[PDB]
Design a protein around this ligand. Structure first.
Ligand code: NA
Lengths: 51, 235, 74
């Protein structure tokens, strides 16, 4: 079920055989925890700067 | 923009400004990647040469941050409709590539499905650009952003005195004096999700600015998502 | 950057003149759509304030009831 909280996925939540499966925008790669996204780069799209 | 606020530094980095042969900004663009800018098909109908300035915050002043990218090639959507701004979408590929930095980073394209389901069903999005600050006001010398609530379709459709094709969507206020305006077209409409900004629309057209009973209308990028990809193949 | 007149405003993009209400009227079936573009696509042009037709002859934006002067040259 994605619809509880995007299946706690930080970006693209989806469902595979009744299992939410998180994913991410190019630039990112899914943390091991399968929920989050680790920028595999210094300027991942979508995050503002000041950082 | 008509009433929102200046983007603080770092705040609106995917913002691009298309500029005329006189360095006057005439439209915007969302920075998709180092060589690509997403804009509105229609900002490019006059035809004369134009460039791209990423990194700008105040326009009455140059002051480092800026950079002008020469367009190497432009891909207008082929079913556009001057008469009705249908398919008002187009990508620009820069000759040289953008150097991401503070104030200069791209915005993420969402996954259609997730966008339609999770994104476009968020309560709002964020329009942004160097546009005049009032329907009959002047262009803003400073970059401004504005949070605009998604408006429901028929609600949109019945309020417009013109066609709302499914390649377009509505956003803003019925009455509140806040909206995007001339000079803002082709700018980003990005919807945020957990501190990530996904491109969800392009600043297209609209009856006046902030007019009671009217919304601003945006190109539904979530429907040129594949278009945008193939568009970045161009070889 | 043309200098506007009493009753006209300055459209620093021009895209708005095409839609001015013209004195001896008779409106298009569909207004010039250029007027709905949110792009700053043309040079500044003085165009009528809302509620001011442009008297065709005397190049001006008057109230409605004042659309009426006859011209001839010598
Ligand atoms: Na409104």
């Amino acid at each position: 079920l994605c619809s509880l909280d995007n299946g706690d996925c930080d970006q693209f939540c989806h469902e595979e055989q009744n299992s939410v499966v998180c994913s991410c925008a190019r630039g990112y790669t899914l943390a091991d925890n399968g929920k989050a996204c680790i920028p595999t780069g210094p300027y991942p799209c979508g995050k503002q700067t000041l950082e | 923009i008509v009433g929102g606020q200046e983007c603080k530094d770092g705040e609106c980095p995917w913002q691009a400004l298309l500029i005329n042969e006189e360095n006057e900004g005439f439209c915007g663009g969302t920075i998709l990647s180092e060589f690509y800018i997403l804009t509105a098909a229609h900002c490019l109908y006059q035809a004369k040469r134009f460039k791209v300035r990423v990194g700008d915050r105040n326009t009455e002043q140059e002051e480092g941050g800026e950079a002008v990218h020469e367009v190497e090639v432009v891909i207008k959507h082929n079913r556009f409709t001057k008469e009705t701004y249908d398919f008002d979408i187009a990508v620009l590929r820069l000759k040289t590539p953008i150097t991401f930095r503070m104030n200069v980073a791209p915005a993420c394209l969402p996954e259609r499905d997730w966008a339609e389901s999770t994104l476009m069903t968020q309560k709002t999005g964020i329009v942004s650009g160097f546009g005049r600050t009032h329907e009959k006001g002047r262009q803003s010398t400073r970059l401004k952003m504005l949070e605009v609530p998604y408006v429901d379709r028929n609600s949109c459709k019945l309020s417009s005195s013109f066609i709302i094709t499914q390649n377009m969507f509505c956003a803003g206020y019925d009455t509140k004096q806040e909206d995007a305006c001339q000079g803002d077209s082709g700018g980003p409409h990005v919807t945020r999700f957990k501190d990530t900004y996904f491109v969800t629309g392009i600043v297209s057209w609209g009856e006046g600015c902030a007019r009671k009973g009217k919304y601003g209308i945006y190109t539904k990028v979530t429907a040129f998502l594949k278009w945008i990809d193939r568009s970045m193949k161009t070889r | 950057y043309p200098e506007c007149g009493e009753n006209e405003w300055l459209d620093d993009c021009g895209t708005q003149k095409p839609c001015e209400a013209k004195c001896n009227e008779e409106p298009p079936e569909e207004e010039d759509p250029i007027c709905r573009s949110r792009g700053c696509l043309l040079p500044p042009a003085c165009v009528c304030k809302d509620g001011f037709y442009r008297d065709t002859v005397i190049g001006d934006c008057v109230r409605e009831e004042e659309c009426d002067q006859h011209e001839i040259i010598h």
